[PDB]
Design a protein around this ligand. Structure first.
Ligand SMILES: CC(=O)N[C@H]1[C@H]([C@H](O)[C@H](O)CO)O[C@@](O[C@H]2[C@@H](O)[C@@H](CO)O[C@@H](O[C@H]3[C@H](O)[C@@H](O)[C@H](O)O[C@@H]3CO)[C@@H]2O)(C(=O)O)C[C@@H]1O
Ligand SMILES: CC(=O)N[C@H]1[C@H]([C@H](O)[C@H](O)CO)O[C@@](O[C@H]2[C@@H](O)[C@@H](CO)O[C@@H](O[C@H]3[C@H](O)[C@@H](O)[C@H](O)O[C@@H]3CO)[C@@H]2O)(C(=O)O)C[C@@H]1O
Lengths: 171, 171
């Protein structure tokens, strides 16, 4: 029920802005000053300009390092987000990871969907669910995903907790 | 702290999937069966194919009406989301509204940022905060935003509740 720092970095649907208090809506109250994510009046900073900073809600990082949508943002020089130019990764880009957990197709492009996440998927939210750890010739997950006691890659208490064999293990 | 139906349609950051239980993570537990939003293994349905259905997390609606990112999705025939082709609206498109509350520039394109939301913004999350209601020659908000007792357009208890003069007023 809450967004931002109070909702553990949860985002409002349909780009509703998250007020300074951690609640979702539209208007000056939510989108003006203190806005956390969503359609904030003062676009957030991102990319190079703001330290490698990614945009929330999948917004595009424009060449000037401001968050938004449209040609000025997803167009020429976009630094991140669903850019208009195919985003490269994988073995064919010296292991680069796609941002925001997007899957890296077999061919070295960042995206989401069966074609990217499906078989051959190199990194990101692959849906191939390949086994990691001891029971897997001790192979490690990508993106620093935790390798659960079960020999599964993921993020969550169940994966990263007790008997987490590798990855961003809390335990 | 919760997502989906349990988090009032709140979305996980960095396309983390929302399990059937309303919690955020990555892996089979969250992204497999019951997945609500985010990088679900089974891309959600959208657009024409799924009743005008929009994609969560700002994903692109591919021509086949499946949710995702990359050329197959934001490319040719995209039906919604941050499509690779400029999205039209406004007076210059018989009042069309941009989807997901994006601002409709002065020129009739959908986007987010100062250039779209800034002065001339026609609909969506305009940041111009123009007055609505009684104190405003009785002008109505766009997107069915509520016109708060104060003469402000927005979405939230404060706008849509008590003394909501127009819009998607709960009161
Ligand atoms: C697509 C995109 O990234 N758009 C931005 C724009 C553009 O970056 C801008 O048009 C650059 O050509 O900037 C927006 O914010 C600007 C606004 O705050 C102005 C007001 O002076 O300043 C711009 O930065 C100034 C900065 O404030 C000064 O400290 C600095 O000395 O000069 C800077 C030069 O840009 C901000 O970028 C805008 O509304 O114009 C926001 C868009 O999202
Ligand atoms: C970019 C995009 O929208 N991609 C989809 C694809 C494409 O729509 C597909 O390649 C169409 O050319 O479809 C994906 O799902 C498909 C998969 O479930 C297969 C398995 O048979 O079925 C496709 O729909 C079948 C449907 O199941 C039958 O009921 C129907 O009689 O024929 C349909 C023909 O498409 C699904 O689209 C895929 O993985 O291929 C998902 C991508 O997101």
């Amino acid at each position: 029920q809450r967004c931002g720092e109070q909702g553990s970095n949860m985002e409002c649907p349909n780009n509703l802005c998250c007020s300074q208090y951690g609640y979702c809506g539209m208007g000056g109250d939510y989108c003006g000053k203190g806005c956390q994510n969503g359609a904030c009046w003062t676009s957030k900073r991102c990319g190079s300009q703001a330290g490698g900073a990614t945009c929330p809600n999948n917004h595009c990082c424009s060449q000037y390092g401001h968050c938004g949508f449209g040609a000025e943002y997803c167009g020429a020089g976009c630094q991140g987000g669903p850019c208009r130019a195919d985003i490269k990764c994988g073995s064919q880009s010296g292991g680069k990871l796609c941002p925001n957990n997007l899957c890296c197709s077999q061919w070295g492009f960042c995206g989401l969907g069966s074609e990217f996440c499906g078989g051959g998927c190199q990194s990101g939210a692959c849906s191939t669910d390949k086994p990691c750890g001891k029971d897997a010739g001790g192979r490690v997950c990508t993106n620093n995903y935790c390798c659960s006691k079960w020999g599964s890659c993921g993020i969550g208490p169940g994966y990263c907790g007790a008997g987490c064999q590798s990855g961003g293990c809390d335990a």
